[PDB]
Symmetry: C3
Amino acid sequence: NGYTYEDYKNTAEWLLSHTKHRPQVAIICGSGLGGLTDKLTQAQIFDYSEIPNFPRSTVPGHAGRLVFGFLNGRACVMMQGRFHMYEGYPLWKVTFPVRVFHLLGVDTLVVTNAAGGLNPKFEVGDIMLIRDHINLPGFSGQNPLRGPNDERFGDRFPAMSDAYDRTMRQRALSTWKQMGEQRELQEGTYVMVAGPSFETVAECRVLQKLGADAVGMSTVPEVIVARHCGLRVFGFSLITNKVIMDYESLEKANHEEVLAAGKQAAQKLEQFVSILMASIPLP
Amino acid sequence: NGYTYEDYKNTAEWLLSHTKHRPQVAIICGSGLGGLTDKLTQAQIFDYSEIPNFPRSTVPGHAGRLVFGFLNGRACVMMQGRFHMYEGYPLWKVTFPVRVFHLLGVDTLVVTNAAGGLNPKFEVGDIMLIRDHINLPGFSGQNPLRGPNDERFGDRFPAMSDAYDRTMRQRALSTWKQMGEQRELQEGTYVMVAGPSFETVAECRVLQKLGADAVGMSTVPEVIVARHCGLRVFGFSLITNKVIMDYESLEKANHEEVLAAGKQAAQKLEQFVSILMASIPLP
Amino acid sequence: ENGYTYEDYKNTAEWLLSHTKHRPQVAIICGSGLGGLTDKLTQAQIFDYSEIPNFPRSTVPGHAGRLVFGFLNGRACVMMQGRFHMYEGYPLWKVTFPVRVFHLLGVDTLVVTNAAGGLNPKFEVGDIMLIRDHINLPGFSGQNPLRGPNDERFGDRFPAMSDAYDRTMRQRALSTWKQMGEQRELQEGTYVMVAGPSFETVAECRVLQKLGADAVGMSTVPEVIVARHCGLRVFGFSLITNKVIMDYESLEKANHEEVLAAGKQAAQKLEQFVSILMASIPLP
Ligand SMILES: O=c1[nH]cnc2c(CN[C@H](CO)[C@H](O)CO)c[nH]c12
Ligand SMILES: O=c1[nH]cnc2c(CN[C@H](CO)[C@H](O)CO)c[nH]c12
Ligand SMILES: O=c1[nH]cnc2c(CN[C@H](CO)[C@H](O)CO)c[nH]c12
């Protein structure tokens, strides 16, 4: 880890000196989901370029801005754009903002992503509650907690079996009928894979049979640092495409599709997240 | 990646300046598969060490020579010997030649390799058509496309589910009867594993039940960057050993047995590659 | 890509060799909270890792950072009290460095010990599981200590691992167990190495279970691999210190404090088991 505690704290203090907003909740917007910053009231925007030690969003459509505001009674900071391992960033860079959020006094993180559907019962545009994850990069060494541990942040060995807040999940489930949607809110396991290339049929069949329900190349490392420093974590994927499972499909996965599915799902995601805010425990 | 796009152009311009051959098809030769250059007419030979940015071949069975010539009419360039991640090479060094072949004007890549049989039916000396792969190092971050993307080669997010040209595979299947062989032509999934040490029984069983028919430590990275820059890929393995699947056996994998079987099959490979050449479509 | 030369391993070996009178046949690597294994050695000689010219540091709790020479029960031993893990951010060629030094010491048998979370339903906390096989997940994807130029003088370019865990010793541990006097049986199974440092999620543990692995830890495999590289005989066992969380309704979680304490509970059992094992090891 090429960042000291002192690195995080300078970023954290820079923000505190540059905004009057004091966020309780941080929200990471995945591909094509940048539009959840739309309903924030009294919003103050920062380009990542502006912020000391911030990596940049290079993939479309990640805008690369940090937005402060109020959403449904809640003091929020939003990541309009995130970072990925496949852009060549070490995981301690990809997850850098999460520690700076904690230093700001954020106690809850919500992580959003576009994800390819593995489970046959998912249609495109489905929202899936992330119940759990499978961390393939982590299994083999790629874990943002590798190296010296700083107990000011958390333990040498934090458990991950309760990563996704059980209570918020139950709340979002029963909350769902207020969305008034003709489709049920999905629950499932997210599997992280590094990319940047999409998956083969063979690879999909393994993922599906590992028990994963959706696949993407993000999010998991953010969760892992978030939990390490004790934040409540809530996550959901938007199912942008169904991964190709047969060898006779002339169909192929593409980012264009995944950004398009993120646009169709704007108003539904806006509303879902809005509602969600109200269900977050006070400090 | 440590290579600028210009670094590739230099190697390409250099090759173009030192041979009048204009390859259409590129061919990468696996361990003990170097004999495939034998049938090139008007062959022109290069030591890898002559070619400005080329890595070296350190594994026995890999001659370290690049040869331009005509294979049964078709203008080819062959990698007599390849590179592996386990030699200490990053994947951007490993697959560097593919990128240069693309700039050479190569439109087709044939990847060859020796593999251990995971599928119970397969025998030593069988040729398996690679239909699809499972990229295990790719799952956890070891993918040659990691880092900034150069649009001059491909897209940030290329699909892989159509990696191994269907038509070429089907044609190879029709045409196998010309070989006058008593075994059939096999078709299956290659799983890439990084080694350099051979698999345990237990690892072999996970690989078997993941849906893999053959195992080795090469090829997939090459294929990923071939496809990323639009080349049509064809791939096959020579099954050189049956990987150990139980604890009572006193047999263990060794590279020497791998090169021994490469030598036994030299005539059939040459005869198969020949074809294969006749049916590669013109530019 | 290994930072160490043959000369480097050799300086360390010769340094130990002049600083001790001991000539160990056997090396034992103690896992988390298995350090208590050093206590039964006779005519002991302790070296801090920081004294030995090329050794790395042990950072994690339950790992003392010591090399101890002595006789276990007439058997000449060297024990690593503490070990190194990849998650501390060490290259695997630092993690495994002492294994090649033990080889140059004249050690021909290596015994690796670890604490592990049980994946197998039938394992109980406090069980000893003989390791028969492993699944090397960082290996699958590149993280293998042998990556890079091969040192010919230690071993082959592509060494086999299917025979890694000496069959005869395991059988002797099996038929000899009646000596231990436990109304629990000696377990046997496959160790799956995961990198860590965080513990596994439920779904992770489910994949690991269906991969056929019986016990999960974050160490051991790299040491085993380079042991066999230089042709040491290898024996492996896990202490099952916790049952891995396998369902969403549970309020329990894996924690390192529970791991360290199960080791302290099991010490007399391990002590006893390790000594009978030393009767099993073949003479040079
Ligand atoms: O099918 C998919 N396979 C893998 N990932 C994925 C995603 C998420 N997007 C990726 C980042 O994690 C990447 O930006 C390509 O869309 C959407 N759809 C898929
Ligand atoms: O059994 C095998 N397990 C793994 N790889 C493999 C190969 C291919 N050869 C390897 C590199 O890919 C390596 O050179 C050892 O043969 C032939 N046979 C096997
Ligand atoms: O449940 C576990 N999951 C992973 N590892 C593990 C161990 C072994 N200890 C680990 C290092 O290998 C780590 O020190 C935390 O205990 C004991 N119990 C477990």
